[PDB]
Design a protein around this ligand. Structure first.
Ligand code: 5O4
Length: 255
């Protein structure tokens, strides 16, 4: 019932997809009736540090568009001293909500999603970006294909489930993203994150950094998938598999 203007183009508001303390995301329709997601950011209470973080991510988002299609499209944007309007690709659902709604996962769908995650994270790394906060919520399903929604640059629940040992110790290299990605795959495999069973946050963090605390990897018909999980989950970042190595792995390459 409402409408908005971005770069002299008019958009009809359908609904609010998401909300933030200073931001909101809306599902909208353009003049040709194409559907988009518009992210609205309010800059009234934003300090200079916050503004540079927002500007930096937008610049990386705009630049990386060309490099991979596994990164959400940023069609256009309007930025003033008061607000930011970003016209972007509209997804179907985030990977967190999708995994929560679904009981079992297809092996083919899982592999397909893993490849997409690897391609999106590889792309940011090539540009010197390490997300450091990967979670299923950072991924969006668009046309049966996963897309990275953010780069971790802009100022931002803060779950510790996908947090690597080196991030807990430091209170961080591309290998940090490998651990988080592994946790996601682990969830996609076993239906829970490696330390989901540990309810107390302090007891949980200790386990993640505990060498003795053994991560269980129950036997599954996909041995390649079992190996990826063990390779991603090595506590020592130096013993952990890299993204380029994950791309040449049998799990993503063999039929
Ligand atoms: C479900 C459906 C669509 C989107 C979405 N598609 N494109 C988006 C661009 C920026 N932000 C979101 C978002 C984040 C939380 O709520 C919406 C986007 C996200 C989740």
């Amino acid at each position: 019932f409402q409408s908005m203007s971005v770069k002299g183009r008019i958009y009809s508001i359908l609904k609010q997809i998401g909300s933030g303390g200073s931001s909101k995301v809306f599902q909208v329709l353009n003049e040709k009736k194409q559907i988009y997601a518009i992210k609205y950011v309010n800059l009234e209470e934003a300090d200079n540090q916050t503004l540079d973080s927002y500007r930096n991510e937008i610049a990386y988002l705009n630049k990386l568009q060309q490099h991979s299609d596994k990164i959400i499209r940023l069609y256009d944007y309007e930025i003033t001293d008061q607000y930011i309007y970003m016209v972007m690709e509209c997804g179907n659902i985030d990977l967190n909500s999708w995994l929560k709604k679904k009981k079992s996962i297809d092996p083919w769908e899982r592999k397909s999603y893993w490849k997409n995650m690897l391609e999106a994270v590889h792309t940011i790394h090539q540009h010197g970006i390490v997300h450091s906060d990967l979670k299923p919520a950072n991924f969006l399903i668009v046309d049966g294909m996963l897309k990275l929604i953010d780069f971790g640059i802009a100022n931002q629940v803060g779950t510790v489930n996908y947090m690597p040992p080196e991030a807990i110790k430091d209170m961080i290299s591309p290998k940090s993203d490998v651990w988080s990605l592994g946790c996601i795959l682990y969830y996609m495999t076993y239906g829970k994150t490696p330390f989901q069973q540990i309810i107390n946050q302090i007891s949980k963090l200790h386990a993640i950094i505990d060498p003795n605390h053994e991560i269980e990897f129950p036997d599954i018909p996909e041995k390649d998938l079992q190996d990826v999980l063990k390779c991603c989950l090595k506590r020592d970042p130096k013993q952990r598999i890299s993204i380029p190595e994950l791309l040449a792995h049998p799990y993503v390459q063999i039929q």
